[PDB]
Design a protein around this ligand. Structure first.
Ligand code: NI
Length: 341
């Protein structure tokens, strides 16, 4: 049944709750972003109001065929009224179109639901600075001190320098980047920009990117693989067998692959700096696992929460085991005693 951490008290609303059938008493279903564990359940047969960003609404219409009459896109950073309740959508710094949702309950309680997010100090200067938040529904994906990772900027500098050096040493090398969802577009787009190429991809993936309002996108992507030396493939195909097979398909245009897998975290982060990352190599194929995250590190999460000073935290991730729940609650208490709220 629908878990409590998906329901907004004092309203008829749910967040990211499309796989439970008709949730009894729900008048408005919000969707924070277009990732499958969150939209699971939506289709052209859904007939209740969906509230979301413009970009998420484009993806609902074009990829899932949800009918337009049930899609209610909202502008960001703007006070809107939904079924009698004031709400605001804020940028979550996750994937394109991903939002956090502020709810102003009729009784005076203010609730922030982060959806999935990568906390950032810029958020301390949004509409969040303007009133107190009582209850925080928090993306706790990486809520343990072992999870450190570099800035997105550091990771993209590493990827651009590596790709440019490889292709300038060997003009017959192909660059391949893995994907299985929206998000992390800066990885492949930055590499294509330094090489003077478009990114080549499947018709399905091209359609997805064309829903994202990214400026000048017609100038950066293409379905013509032959004209491109940066190819996007499914993440599953980013292994030696999959890559050797792809190289066969290019008809001797290329003699080497350099491949990137933008993972979240991997335990090479508890030891290794970004400067010190090395690939797995077999023959003329090299694979680089790079720690490009669209979720908060532990320290980013901790800073955001100690700034916001909520009265109550409701985790939304890692909630399925008692040891994970109890560990997170211990961190929340440490943070509150350190900061004095
Ligand atoms: Ni997500």
């Amino acid at each position: 049944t629908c878990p409590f951490y998906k329901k907004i008290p004092g309203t008829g609303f749910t967040v990211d709750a499309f796989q439970y059938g008709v949730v009894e008493g729900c008048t408005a279903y919000f969707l924070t972003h277009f990732h499958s564990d969150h939209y699971a359940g939506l289709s052209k047969h859904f007939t209740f109001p969906v509230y979301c960003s413009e970009i998420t609404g484009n993806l609902l219409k074009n990829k899932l065929h949800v009918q337009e009459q049930y899609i209610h896109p909202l502008p960001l950073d703007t006070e809107c009224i939904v079924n009698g309740v004031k709400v605001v959508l804020l940028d979550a710094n996750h994937c394109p179109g991903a939002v956090m949702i502020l709810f102003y309950l009729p009784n005076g309680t203010v609730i922030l639901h982060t959806g999935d997010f990568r906390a950032d100090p810029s958020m301390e200067r949004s509409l969040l600075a303007d009133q107190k938040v009582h209850m925080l529904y928090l993306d706790t994906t990486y809520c343990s001190p072992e999870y450190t990772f570099p800035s997105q900027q550091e990771v993209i500098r590493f990827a651009i320098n590596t790709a440019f050096e490889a292709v300038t040493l060997n003009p017959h090398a192909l660059v391949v980047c893995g994907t299985y969802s929206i998000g992390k577009e800066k990885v492949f787009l930055a590499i294509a920009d330094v090489l003077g190429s478009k990114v080549g991809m499947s018709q399905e993936k091209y359609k997805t990117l064309q829903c994202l309002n990214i400026p000048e996108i017609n100038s950066l992507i293409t379905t013509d693989m032959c004209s491109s030396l940066v190819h996007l493939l499914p993440m599953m195909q980013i292994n030696f067998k999959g890559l050797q097979s792809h190289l066969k398909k290019c008809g001797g245009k290329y003699n080497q692959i350099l491949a990137f897998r933008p993972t979240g975290w991997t335990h090479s982060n508890k030891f290794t700096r970004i400067a010190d990352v090395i690939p797995q190599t077999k023959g003329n194929i090299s694979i680089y696992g790079i720690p490009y995250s669209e979720h908060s590190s532990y320290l980013e999460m901790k800073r955001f929460v100690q700034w916001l000073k909520p009265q109550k935290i409701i985790p939304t991730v890692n909630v399925g085991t008692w040891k994970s729940r109890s560990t997170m609650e211990k961190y929340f208490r440490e943070w509150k005693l350190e900061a004095g709220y």
